[PDB]
Amino acid sequence: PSELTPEERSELKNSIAEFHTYQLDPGSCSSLHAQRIHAPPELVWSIVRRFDKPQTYKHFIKSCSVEQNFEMRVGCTRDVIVISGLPANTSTERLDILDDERRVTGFSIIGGEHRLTNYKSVTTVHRFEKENRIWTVVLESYVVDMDTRMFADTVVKLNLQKLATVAEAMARN
Amino acid sequence: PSELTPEERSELKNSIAEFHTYQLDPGSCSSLHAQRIHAPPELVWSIVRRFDKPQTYKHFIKSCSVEQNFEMRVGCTRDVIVISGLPANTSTERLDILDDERRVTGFSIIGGEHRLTNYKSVTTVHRFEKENRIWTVVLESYVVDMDTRMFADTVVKLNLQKLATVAEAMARN
Ligand SMILES: Cc1ccc(CS(=O)(=O)Nc2ccc(C#N)c(C3CC3)c2)cc1
Numbered sequence: 097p098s099e100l101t102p103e104e105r106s107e108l109k110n111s112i113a114e115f116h117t118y119q120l121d122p123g124s125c126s127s128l129h130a131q132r133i134h135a136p137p138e139l140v141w142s143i144v145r146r147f148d149k150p151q152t153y154k155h156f157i158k159s160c161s162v163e164q165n166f167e168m169r170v171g172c173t174r175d176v177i178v179i180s181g182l183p184a185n186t187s188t189e190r191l192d193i194l195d196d197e198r199r200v201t202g203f204s205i206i207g208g209e210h211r212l213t214n215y216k217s218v219t220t221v222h223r224f225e226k227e228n229r230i231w232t233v234v235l236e237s238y239v240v241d242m243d244t245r246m247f248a249d250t251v252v253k254l255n256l257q258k259l260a261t262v263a264e265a266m267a268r269n
Numbered sequence: 270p271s272e273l274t275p276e277e278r279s280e281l282k283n284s285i286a287e288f289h290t291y292q293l294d295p296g297s298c299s300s301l302h303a304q305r306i307h308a309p310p311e312l313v314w315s316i317v318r319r320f321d322k323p324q325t326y327k328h329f330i331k332s333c334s335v336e337q338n339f340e341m342r343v344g345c346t347r348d349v350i351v352i353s354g355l356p357a358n359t360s361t362e363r364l365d366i367l368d369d370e371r372r373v374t375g376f377s378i379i380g381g382e383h384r385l386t387n388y389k390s391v392t393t394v395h396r397f398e399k400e401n402r403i404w405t406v407v408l409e410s411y412v413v414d415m416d417t418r419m420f421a422d423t424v425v426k427l428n429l430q431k432l433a434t435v436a437e438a439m440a441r442n
């Protein structure tokens with residue numbers, strides 16, 4: 097990630113090896129993106145961990161539904177309807193990992209009308225502290241089958257930026 | 270300013286001595302405030318130098334008028350009308366200093382219905398760079414005659430925060 101400082105890259109080497117390295121299946125495409133956020137990591141995590149409410153920190157979502165008496169645990173699902181004018185209409189997604197202690201979460205696409213077969217994403221949230229400053233870096237990686245990388249990278253980048261905007265609005269003193 | 274890092278305070282010592290130190294007139298009150306802004310200093314300066322448009326980076330302004338064929342130069346004035354519900358109704362203000370090369374500007378209150386007699390403010394905009402990061406610190410100080418300090422400090426703080434929000438919105442990639 098070309099936005100991270102040398103110190104940020106050094107402190108994140110472990111997390112990248114631990115959560116963002118893939119054994120690529122035949123015929124795939126993977127990328128890692130980073131976003132610096134000037135807000136406390138506990139706040140950033142409280143936003144991005146809400147699997148049932150991706151529209152609150154992502155673009156392009158017309159609506160997101162979950163079942164009645166929804167319980168956020170691995171295996172739960174969400175039904176996303178995409179706004180018009182994109183190369184996707186609907187997506188059914190499954191929560192793959194939720195680690196509140198380590199601030200790791202991830203999901204997989206398991207259905208829908210779109211072109212991102214076998215898409216799987218992992219997001220991690222990281223605390224930085226130096227002198228009297230506390231800030232966050234979010235890392236998000238994906239793998240997907242098979243322009244494709246350009247579209248998926250740009251969406252992931254824009255969504256990380258929305259997450260940053262939301263968290264920074266909430267963190268204002 | 271308790272928000273600045275030790276490194277920021279060290280690099281700003283010169284500017285504080287140069288632009289933000291006062292020979293206090295009899296019966297006064299002065300304070301210095303700082304705001305970190307995650308945007309380029311040239312962008313921050315382009316916003317805050319607009320003496321004719323304080324409502325675009327400050328709170329509490331119902332309207333701000335300037336004369337026809339306004340020219341922004343030292344001695345020009347602006348007529349501010351404050352929103353209702355505050356200890357001030359109107360303010361006439363004069364541009365005291367405009368230094369585009371050094372990024373220093375300042376103004377004085379010269380009339381109006383309010384309780385801030387002989388209010389004078391100076392704002393400076395500062396570039397910071399470290400590794401691949403570029404950011405801004407804004408310093409704003411005032412002096413005013415004679416609760417008063419609490420009200421004026423809180424307004425200056427909130428306005429610096431609005432400036433930060435505007436600049437950071439404009440700087441999004
Ligand atoms: C690249 C990518 C895939 C999935 C998601 C989560 S989501 O925005 O809730 N759902 C979703 C699923 C598939 C696609 C496609 N193509 C999209 C497109 C970004 C509209 C969103 C976000 C970003």
Ligand SMILES: Cc1ccc(CS(=O)(=O)Nc2ccc(C#N)c(C3CC3)c2)cc1
Nearest residue numbers: 323329349351356357360383385421424
């Ligand atoms: C403390 C202070 C004084 C002046 C300004 C510039 S302004 O907001 O355009 N005008 C102004 C003048 C006097 C007062 C008072 N009291 C105020 C109050 C903040 C509403 C604004 C901003 C902040």
